[PDB]
């Protein structure tokens, strides 16, 4: 629901600072792919994969 | 339409001073991408994304 | 929106050219005299009103 | 009497869009202090000072 | 407190009659409006500071002041 | 790499002629100028700096 709650559900709460600094809401995240997520500092494929598939589960 | 109403609609009124100092009109904003917006001090991806998509919705059908 | 735009310039008769050519306000903003001649706006006066209209509307 | 004419007289015409978007009339501006003006985005003390003192004369 | 007044008449008196639909949809009476500040009014869609200011000061004058 | 007066006219920035004359900005000086350097000589609008930078880029290439 909130981006903090979304990350917690994927076990990715430790990524919270990137999302806060870049002002990424769960709605902004919905329009983001691998290239956009690499741009904001999500360097691990596994993390981007979890985020992309996580938004797909909802959206 | 004007920038002040445009920013308010996206909930980005706090960016009003950057737009005023840089004399950014909707015409200028329409040709701006992520690199151009970073140049004027819009450092958050989320803010640039909202601006870019906002102009797309505004000037599209 | 583009229909509202044309109406404001008294150019409502150009609605069909704009619809057929899929010209939105974003497309119109990047168009000059040569591009407008290409879609069939043959009168200078009409192209001038469109170009200056987008300039006034967008800031700008 | 027109907020646009008032702003012009103080050399603060650049502030017109904030006043229009926030629907601030001279009557509204008359009950506004430094805290209320900061709230609508008048971030410079000098600008708030000119506005407050400007309305004080218009009485 | 005597604020049993018609919200339609209240808005008209402030020159804010155009807000009639927000107040009707949200079922805002004068008694509800009396406990509302800038944050609560922003929440129901009253986005202009000037409009919220007029409403808050309008209820104050109807209540005596502050 | 001609007279600066012709360059500004081509971009519709002829009103900037006095800044360029007073600051003794030639096209070769302008070619090494970015957004920070142009802000320093009084070009406060992003749109004007953008037009100047991109204008010299086209001239060079």
Author numbering:
A (entry chain E), D (entry chain B): 1029 to 1087
B (entry chain D): 1029 to 1089
C (entry chain A): 1030 to 1089
E (entry chain C): 1025 to 1090
F (entry chain F): 1028 to 1088
Tell me, in the authors' exact words, what the paper reports.
The poly(ADP-ribose) polymerases (PARPs) Tankyrase (TNKS and ARTD5) and Tankyrase 2 (TNKS2 and ARTD6) regulate Wnt-β-catenin signaling (Huang et al., 2009). We report crystal structures of the polymerizing TNKS and TNKS2 sterile alpha motif (SAM) domains, revealing versatile head-to-tail interactions.
We also crystallized the TNKS SAM domain, which again required a polymer-breaking mutation. The TNKS SAM domain was highly similar to that of TNKS2 (left). The repeating unit consisted of six SAM domains with pitches of 83 and 79 Å, almost twice as long as for TNKS2. However, the equivalent residues (D1059T1, K1066T1, and K1081T1, respectively) mediated binding between a subset of protomers in the TNKS SAM crystal structures.
